[model samples]
Target: GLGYGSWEIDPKDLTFLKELGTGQFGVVKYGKWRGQYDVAIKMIKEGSMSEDEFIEEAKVMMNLSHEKLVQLYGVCTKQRPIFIITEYMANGCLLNYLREMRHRFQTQQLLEMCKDVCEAMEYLESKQFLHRDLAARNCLVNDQGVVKVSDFGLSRYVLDDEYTSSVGSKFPVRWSPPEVLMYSKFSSKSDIWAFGVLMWEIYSLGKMPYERFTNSETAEHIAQGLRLYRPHLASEKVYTIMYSCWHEKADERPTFKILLSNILDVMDEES
Candidate 1:
C-alpha cells in the first residue's frame, strides 16, 4: 500500500565513517544520513548484480518496519556506486559480537535473542518476503544488545557460498536444506531450516556450522540427516524447539508464527 515517493535518499547528506565489514559486492560502512541518523551505508560495487534489481527490491522493503527487524532507511541511486542505507546497530554483527565480547550472555538473554529474530522473521513472511539468508552474521546487535535481523531484502548483496554457479544464485551451503542443496529451490521452509542453524550458532556461542565439513561434503551430510548437536546450554525442551525447525520434510517444519508462540511459552517457564 506504499510507493517509493520518499525512499530516495540524498547521497550528499551521507557521511562515511568507518568500514563495518566487507560486503560481497562492495563495502558496508558505518555512516550518518542527513547527519542525524546513524546508518550503515552499503555501497554496491558496479556490475556486481543488476542495479535495477536491487533498487526494485528495496521498494517493497521501504515500508517494512518492525522493532525486531533492521530498518532500511533509504537508498542512493543517482550516484556512481549505489548506496543502500540501513539503520546502524551499535554492537555490530551478532556473529562477531558473540565471539569477541568479554561478557558471556546469560541463558535467558540467549533465548531472548532467538525470540527477537524469530518474530521479525514472522513479520517478514507476513509481508510475503523471504530472507533466504538468515544467519547470525546477517543479524546485528544494537546498543541495548538486542539482535535484529539486518537488511534482509538486500540478501542478494551476499553470495558467500563457497561455490557459485550460473545455474542459480548461491546460498550458504551449511545453512541450506536438502531441497535447496539439490534443486536450487528456495521457499520459506529453507529459511526455517537456516533458522535452526542460527539457533545452534547462538547456543554454541557463535561456532561455525559444519565447522569440520567441507562445503562439498555438507550437502551430502545434511541429506543424510546429520543435524547439528545440541549446544551445552540447551535443555531438552529448548533443543526440541530448535530441532523442529530442521525437519526433513518442509511440511513438518513449523511456520515462524508457530515458532514464535513456542518461544513465548519457553520464556514464560523461565521464571
Candidate 2:
C-alpha cells in the first residue's frame, strides 16, 4: 500500500519527546523521526479498527497536499501501535495558542488566521472533503502564526455532493448547523456553518461558541433560529460575514470563496 517504499517508517527510529494529547482511538506525541525531522506522531492502538480501515485513512491523508493543511509525512503499520507521522506545528492547537496569546495579537492577525483557515477549507471544498469537525481546537498554528486545518479522521470524500452518515455521528454542537444536528447530513455548506463558529472563537479569543448553554440547549436554540451574539471584539463588517454563515438554510450561507473575498475586503477596508 502507498508504493511500499518511503511511506512506512521504522517505529524505533522515532523518539518521543513529549506527550501531546490523547483520544479514544489514539495518542498524539511530540516526536522526531530519523533523528532529524520534527514530527507529531499519532499512535493508534491495534484493534482500534481493521488494517484496511487504517490504510484507507492513511491514503486519504497522504493524497491531500495543501499549504494550509497539515502535511501527513508517513505511516508505520507493521508494529503494535500504528504511527501517523505529520509535520510538527510549533504553536500547537490554535484554540489553546490563542487563549494564551490573545492579549498580544492585533485584530488583523486574528483575521489573518481566519482567512488562512478559510482558504484551507476552500481547498477541501474543491476536493469534496467533508471536514465533519472544523473548529479552533481542530486547527494548528505554525511558529510564524500561520494556521492549518488538521484532524481529518472523520472527513469523507463526497462523490455525490452530500454525505449522510449511517452511524450516529458525534459533532461539536456549537459548531454544527441545523441540518447536521437533525439529519446527519453533511455538505461543504455545513462546513461553512462551522467556519462561522470558528470565526466566533477567534473574535472571542477562544471562548466557547455557546459558553452559557448546554449542548442540548445550544442545539435547541440554533434550531429555533438563534445565532451567536456578535463578539465584542469583532468589527461590524466582520460580524456581518459571521452572521451570513449561520443562515437557517444551508444553501443561503456563502461559499468559502465568497467568505474569503468578504474577509479580504474587510482587511482592505481596515488597512
Candidate 3:
C-alpha cells in the first residue's frame, strides 16, 4: 500500500533548498527529490498530527487530479517528521503574486485569473468536495500564470453536500459567511461567498476584506446585510456578481457553475 502509484518517497532523497513557509502543523520547504525532481516538501512535524489524520487526508488528495489543482507527488510517513511532496509553484501564493504583479496586469487579466480559480472550484463542486477554506492565500500560481487551488486542510468530500464543524472550530473570519460563523455549516454556497471575497482581493490587489473592522464587528456587519463594496478597480457588472454571492440567503448565492459561466461570458465580451 505504501508504494501505490509510487506515492512513497525516501525522505533522504529529498534535498531541502530553502524554507517556504511554516504553519501550526508543519514547515514547507522547497527541495529536490532524488536529485532530480523539483518539489515543495511539506514536513508535518511529529506530535502535530497523528498518522491516521495524515493518511486520511493524503489518501483523498491522491485521488484528486486536475490541471488547476496542485499535484501531490508522494509521502514519506514510514518515519518521524512525515513528508508530503507536491508540485513547486514558481510564482508562489496567488495573493502574494497578485500584490507583486498587480501593476503589470490589465483588468481583463485580473478577471481571467478569477475565472481560472472559479473553474477549479466548479470542478471540486462536481466532485462533491467542499473547499471550506477558499481564499487567494490558499491558492498557488505557477510561472505559466496558472492558478492552482491548494490548501485542503479544511476541505471535505461530502455526499449529502454539507459539513457542520465541531464546536469551537475556527475559520478565517474575514472570508467566512454568516452561516459558517454562526452554525459551523459549510457547503458549496458558502465557498461561493468566500469566492466573492477572493474576487474583491484580486481586484483590490490583495486588500484584506473588512480591514477596518474587528472580527466581532465584521460578523455583525455581515449579519446586518452590510457587505464589501466594489473595489476601486472593479467594474459595476463584476461587482454585481460579487454582491450576488453575499446574499443573506445561502441558496440565493450562485453555484460555481453559474459563477464560472458568468465570468467566462464577461471575458468573452471583453475579448
lDDT, candidates in the order shown? 0.83, 0.82, 0.80
lDDT of 2 at 139: 95
Query: TM-score per candidate, in order?
Result: 0.92, 0.89, 0.89
Q: What is the C-alpha lDDT profile of model 3 across 1-271, one tens digit per residue?
A: 3444455777878899999888645798998988988899887767556566657677777777878888888788777787888999988888888889535878898897898888888888888887788899889988888888886643442212222243323437778888887887788888999999999999988888898987778888987888999898888878887888899899999999999888888778766
For model 1, residues 1-271, the per-residue Cα lDDT tens digits are 1333587888888888898778677798998777777998888888675677777777888989999999998888887688888888988889997786476778788899999999999999898899988899889999998999985856564344433432334557888888888887789998899898998899888988889987777788889987888899987777999999989899899999999999899899974
Name model 2 segments beyond 4 Å from true: 1-6, 46-51, 101-103, 153-170
Candidate 3 lDDT (Cα, 0 to 1):
0.80
Where in model 1 is the C-alpha error above 4 Å? 1-5, 157-170
lDDT of model 1, residue 49: 56
Candidate 2 similarity to native, TM-score: 0.89
What count of clashes does model 3 give? 0
- Residue 27 in candidate 2 has what lDDT? 90
In candidate 2, what are the lDDT values of residues 1-271, reduced to their tens digit?
A: 3435466767778988999888645798998887888999987766554555656677776888899999888788876677778989988889998799535888898899999999998888888887788999889998888999997644442222222242223447788899988887788888899999999999989999889898788889999999999998899999999899999998889999999999999999987
User: In candidate 1, which residue pairs clash?
Assistant: none
Clashing residue pairs in candidate 2 (N, C-alpha, C atoms within 3 angstroms) = none
For TM-score, the strongest prediction is: 1
